[PDB]
Structure 1
Amino acid sequence: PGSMTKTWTLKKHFVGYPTNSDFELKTSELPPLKNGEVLLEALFLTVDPYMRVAAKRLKEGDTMMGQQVAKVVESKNVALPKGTIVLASPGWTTHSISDGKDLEKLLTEWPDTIPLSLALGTVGMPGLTAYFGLLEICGVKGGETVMVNAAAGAVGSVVGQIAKLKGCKVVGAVGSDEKVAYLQKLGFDVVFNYKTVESLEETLKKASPDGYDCYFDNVGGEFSNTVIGQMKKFGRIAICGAISTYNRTGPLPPGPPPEIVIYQELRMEAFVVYRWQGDARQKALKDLLKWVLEGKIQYKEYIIEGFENMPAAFMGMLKGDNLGKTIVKA
């Protein structure tokens, strides 16, 4: 019955970092609800680095992709009554219609003490990425020394804290002194500003002269070439992301020295978080929520108010503004 929505679309494909002129806000009228459908109003929307890469497959005019926490504000579906909170991925839009087959309810034990926006962060997709990347790909068992970059981001910050609660030494790389201070307060063994250190090689050597057992890699590029030169024999690399290339203008940087990869017999595996489904996934979500409640994973969010500022939140996150999960409060 006459609903209106706003939608952020891709006006121009990104060249380097996105700029404001690459996005366009549009207003449309959604149709009335059919049988079994619901009207969803966004409460929190997420912006994520993968959107920079996936945008290349969109056509100009398409809606930007993304997930959101929404509530049902109108319902013709008995399973999804008015007021129900759900996870949905209609893209950058304030209102959408769903038949119920593309939604995901929150954990039944979701308490009132934690913001709903953590369903998009530590107790959501980024937290699951840290969980499986560190515990399954690296396979940490306790006592390892873990190198994690973008350590103050949504994924990296959870990687470090899970590593700490599992008995690991953590060396974290971040892009500002404010982020260094925050992670030092959390208790990370060594944290440094990769933008200001005189030599990345010497900083990593001093942080762990014996080398690194695991490398949770979010950045790639020249940074990873240096870390690879300090991996222990049989060292494991979880190839989570390569954000240093997402906004690159020229050709990719050189690859890591193969003589080091082979002599050290490194194991390097990339992964997508959606690989894990069913029981393993549900167990990981329950563990993440439990650790947040127990205080072993502290929660910090970088909230930006206003749907109209979503392009600016996406661009700021890519440029390192965010401390914790970047969230847009509708």
Structure 2
Amino acid sequence: IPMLAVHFDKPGGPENLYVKEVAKPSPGEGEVLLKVAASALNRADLMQRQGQYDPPPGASNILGLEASGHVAELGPGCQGHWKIGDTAMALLPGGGQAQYVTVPEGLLMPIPEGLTLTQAAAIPEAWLTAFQLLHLVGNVQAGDYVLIHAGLSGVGTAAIQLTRMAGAIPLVTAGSQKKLQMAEKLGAAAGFNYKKEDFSEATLKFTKGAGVNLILDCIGGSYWEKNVNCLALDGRWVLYGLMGGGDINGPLFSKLLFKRGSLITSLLRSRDNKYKQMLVNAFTEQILPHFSTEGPQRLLPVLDRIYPVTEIQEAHKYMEANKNIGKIVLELPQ
């Protein structure tokens, strides 16, 4: 039986995209079908339709790493915890931007109270990655200085708040004064405009010459020279981007050895199910309750713009021009 979903015949630019009737999936041993209300764009969706990000073997080849909606159907061998009608959000390897999606019941998360389904669609990928990067990969401690690159993005806007909730001191880099000001309102200790100034020196000045203890790098090759200088002794330098590189050309080994540094790379989409549940399980204890605490310390999902699925084309152009300040959510017709 049929189903509307985001699609592209051939890999190319954003103009190739359209909504198409594809086959409606079905559950299968410990998973549930989710009637999607709204999904969210991520940078991985851009690369995929250009061809540079194929989904892991078996996972659906259709854009959407996260989704929010209602429980449509139960699969064989479930817990019975989730029931048909319950609201939920999930982390996906694909198939997020389609009316229905098949989701293992482990990776399914409840919606915080006082949040719209459109709002809850902005949580999964951005905050689960942020939480992974900060706590599991980085082991952020109370006192650590943190350098968040592309801080006014999906993951970055989440990272500023989790770093503040972890009791660390976040430092941001972005390409606009308008963005840095929003970064400040998210509890950023300092914000630097990389197009205006050298963030390495700014960071060394802010940390009184000590440097940062943790770097959440998602730029890569254009930043490596600068990242190593402002990295403190024994500092962790978490890599997960390559938006501004992938290639290295210089004495990285020499300088990273001098700072006694550690270059820990990290991925999420490519992980196994045992790992993904463990992350979602850790996240639902440590982080999820604070989306509906009250105000003073309440985590706010940053929404820039909401588009319908029929304007998926115009949404990709908006992300590629770097205009978004937080998440950019798509609504699927129900």
**TM-score, structure 1 as length reference:** 0.79
Answering whether residue 248 of structure 2 is matched by residue 242 of structure 1, we say: no
Match of residue 41 from structure 1: 35
Match of residue 106 from structure 1: 109
Counterpart of 1:175, as a letter, is: G
Match of residue 131 from structure 2: 131
Equivalent of 2:19 in 19, 25, 29? 25
1:262 to partner: Cα distance: 1.2
Match of residue 269 from structure 1: 264
Match of residue 248 from structure 1: none
CA distance in 2, matches of 1:37, 1:288: 24
**Structure 1 residues 328, 24: CA separation in 2 closer, same or farther (over 3 Å shift)?**
closer
Counterpart of 2:288, as a letter, is: L
Match of residue 303 from structure 1: 305
Match of residue 121 from structure 1: 122
- Per-residue CA shift, 1:123-151, capped at 9, x if unaligned? x2321211121123222221111111111
Q: Among the aligned pairs, what percent are the same residue?
A: 18
- Per-residue CA shift, 1:265-314, capped at 9, x if unaligned? 11111122347444553132232222333343233212322101223323
Secondary structure in 2 matching 1:243: coil
Unaligned runs of 5+ residues in structure 1 are 246-250
Answering whether residue 3 of structure 2 is matched by residue 5 of structure 1, we say: yes
RMSD: 3.5
Match of residue 323 from structure 2: 321
Contact 1:39/1:97, CA 8 A, preserved across alignment: yes
1:46 to partner: Cα distance: 1.9
CA distance in 2, matches of 1:42, 1:326: 16
Unaligned runs of 5+ residues in structure 2 are 56-60
CA distance in 1, matches of 2:314, 2:153: 17
**Structure 1 residues 120, 285: CA separation in 2 closer, same or farther (over 3 Å shift)?**
farther
CA distance in 1, matches of 2:26, 2:144: 56
How is 1:1-330 mapped onto 2 (pairs within 5 angstroms)?
4-14=2-12, 18-20=13-15, 22-28=16-22, 40-54=34-48, 55-56=51-52, 63-64=62-63, 66-72=65-71, 82-86=84-88, 87=90, 91=95, 93-96=97-100, 98=102, 104-107=107-110, 110-117=111-118, 119-122=120-123, 124-195=124-195, 197-208=196-207, 209-245=209-245, 252=247, 254=249, 257-273=252-268, 274=271, 276-279=275-278, 281-294=280-293, 295=295, 296=297, 297-330=299-332
CA distance in 2, matches of 1:148, 1:290: 24
Counterpart of 1:9, as a letter, is: H
Secondary structure in 1 matching 2:249: coil
Contact 1:172/1:191, CA 8 A, preserved across alignment: yes
1:53 to partner: Cα distance: 3.8
- Per-residue CA shift, 1:22-41, capped at 9, x if unaligned? 3243235759999x998753
**Structure 1 residues 101, 119: CA separation in 2 closer, same or farther (over 3 Å shift)?**
same
Secondary structure in 1 matching 2:171: strand
1:106 to partner: Cα distance: 2.4
Contact 1:147/1:171, CA 8 A, preserved across alignment: yes
Contact 1:174/1:193, CA 8 A, preserved across alignment: yes
CA distance in 2, matches of 1:187, 1:316: 26
1:198 to partner: Cα distance: 3.5
Contact 2:25/2:100, CA 8 A, preserved across alignment: no
1:57 to partner: Cα distance: 5.6
